Amino acid sequence: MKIRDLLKARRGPLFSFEFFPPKDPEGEEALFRTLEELKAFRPAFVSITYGAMGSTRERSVAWAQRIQSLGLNPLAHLTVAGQSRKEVAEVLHRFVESGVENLLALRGDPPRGERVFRPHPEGFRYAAELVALIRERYGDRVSVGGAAYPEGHPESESLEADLRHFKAKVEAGLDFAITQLFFNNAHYFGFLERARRAGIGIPILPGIMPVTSYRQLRRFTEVCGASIPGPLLAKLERHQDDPKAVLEIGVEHAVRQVAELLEAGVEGVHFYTLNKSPATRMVLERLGLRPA
Amino acid sequence: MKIRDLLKARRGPLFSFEFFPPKDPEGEEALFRTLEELKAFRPAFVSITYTRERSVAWAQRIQSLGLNPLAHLTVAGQSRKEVAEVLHRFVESGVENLLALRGDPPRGGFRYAAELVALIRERYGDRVSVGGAAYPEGHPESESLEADLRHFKAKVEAGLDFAITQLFFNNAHYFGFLERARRAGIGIPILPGIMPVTSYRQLRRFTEVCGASIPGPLLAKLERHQDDPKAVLEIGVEHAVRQVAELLEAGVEGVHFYTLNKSPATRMVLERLGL
Ligand SMILES: Cc1cc2nc3c(=O)[nH]c(=O)nc-3n(C[C@H](O)[C@H](O)[C@H](O)COP(=O)(O)OP(=O)(O)OC[C@H]3O[C@@H](n4cnc5c(N)ncnc54)[C@H](O)[C@@H]3O)c2cc1C
């Protein structure tokens, strides 16, 4: 099913899950056992994140076909970093010929432990270039999403420039966007209001990742650019070495965030889920969405 | 200044006030003494909720105090020419801001507000700024949130510059209304209207009010302290403060306070917010 059509039905909120590349073959089988269990939940779409800069490229195509084999709807993450325009086009074709109908067009992170993006010398620079590629080569045969940053990309120089680049990416041909994770709902609603004033009408799905360890915060603030609201931050940093209390804190905070988002009639919620972590399952149970 | 211009030019969220009207000459003078007191706060605009002779005089009086009136016009209970007449008198007085209404929040011939918006634009073009009411919680007795939103879109398309919502106690329902509006391609400013729950409850005793859902934790807090009006007051103020702090963090263009002259509720709310 195309995500644009799932969204168009307005059948209540779409719940989606994003997983991380498995470390070894037993972890891979464990992850697919988890996706098999997940089908009962009837997720809207599932994905596993892309790019060890390129990847794992044949691996990520294979994982999308395996997800489809389970009767789940894969969203293929497709990046431009570390790859020529022609390599990007090749991988794109491999996903679509494999029956992937949903693509998330992204710039992609730089390589591990490197902070500054530098384009491939014969590659794209901006995700909006990949969106335009897909639309010109496939049109409506696929449904295309992009990332959105309610608190702004760390590398942008103001929220208003950031919004203007987001509008350009939507106009290149997005059907929906999924946000970077955030912990303060008011910054998501405020992004939605900037987007509304800018006449952007596409569905924008909030992305949520419950805090599961204190060591995540540095990735969250510095790399993802998400602020941690004061009351939450206080609790976390008084409990860093009680991983039991950090987890329960993160779960509680995510439950309350998602409850408000669902009461605000968001088009769906996209959950960033560590492969082994029970954080997301606990959130869903506490919300009444999954059996205890 | 026209409200649409105040909004584009704002240096920060705009605060406006809407007073429920007085019952007697005593309460009339106290209201305008409050309004003069208010000049020090530099409110974006002020108004008084819905007898129309006195309405025009009130607008002139507010202007006389150096305040910017948002004049209310309703289609309810009057002919078309009467409506155009009150309209002309407002605009002849130098009122440049008009709120086109059927019902006039917090309260619960032309038939539709949209027809009055369209009349204003026919007669005055863009030389006035026109708002309408918005209902984040709809008319669920009556239609569907979807049908409600279609009606709002039509009213906006008649020529609104901005909307001010009916009061709400659950911010999520205001954010959900904005999201519905976004998906419908409505980009005009829409200001959240807030009334401390005390005041609303007081008001509902006296007249018919437009509905505003009371969330679980607030409804429960109210009931435990149910007798102890200074407790109940405090609960109302604390709830309105938290609502507004979240609204401002979410980049609302302003906040519109519905107030009983009269109650200490709205004064306390502004005070704790550091306004
Ligand atoms: C849901 C989600 C899933 C993700 N999955 C992955 C994944 O699988 N693999 C991975 O490596 N990363 C992934 N990412 C991370 C993402 O790749 C990074 O955050 C990256 O830094 C930004 O990607 P983007 O697609 O938004 O960048 P772009 O939209 O290309 O924007 C990058 C920068 O350029 C600016 N910009 C855009 N257009 C212009 C213009 N034309 N002129 C000047 N500046 C412009 C933007 O404002 C921004 O600062 C994901 C992020 C999200 C939110």
Numbering used by the authors:
A (entry chain A): 1 to 292
B (entry chain B): 1 to 50, 56 to 113, 123 to 289
Provide the publication's sentences verbatim.
Methylenetetrahydrofolate reductase (MTHFR) is one of the key enzymes for production of methionine, which is not only an important amino acid precursor for protein synthesis, but also the precursor of S-adenosylmethionine (AdoMet), which serves as a major methyl donor and a substrate for polyamine synthesis. MTHFR uses NAD(P)H to reduce FAD; subsequently the reduced FAD reduces methylenetetrahydrofolate (CH2-H4folate). Here, we report biochemical properties and unique crystal structures of MTHFR from T. thermophilus HB8, one of the model organisms in structural biology. We demonstrate that the Thermus MTHFR is a dimer, rather than a tetramer, so that its symmetry is perhaps more directly relevant to the dimeric mammalian MTHFR.
From sets of our experimental data, the as-purified MTHFR could be defined as a ‘heterodimer’ comprising apo- and holo- subunits, and the FAD-replete enzyme as a ‘homodimer’ formed by the two holo-subunits. In the apo-subunit, positions of the loop containing Asp109 and helix α7a are dramatically different, although the topology of the β8α8 barrel of the apo-subunit is almost identical to that of the holo-subunit. Asp109 in the apo-subunit interacts with His77, which is close to the N5-position of the isoalloxazine ring of FAD in the holo-subunit. In the holo-subunit of the as-purified MTHFR, corresponding distances were 2.83 Å, 2.68 Å and 4.37 Å, respectively, where the structure was determined from crystals at acidic pH (≈4.4). While the crystallization conditions were different, the conformational change of Thermus MTHFR is likely occurred by the ligand binding rather than by effects of hydrophobic solvent and the low pH, which we used when crystallization of the heterodimer. Similarly, the heterodimer of Thermus MTHFR may be the physiological form, since it is maximally active in catalyzing the physiological reaction. The low surface area found in the intersubunit interface of the heterodimer of Thermus MTHFR would resemble the conformation of human MTHFR without AdoMet, and the homodimer could simulate the AdoMet binding form of human MTHFR.
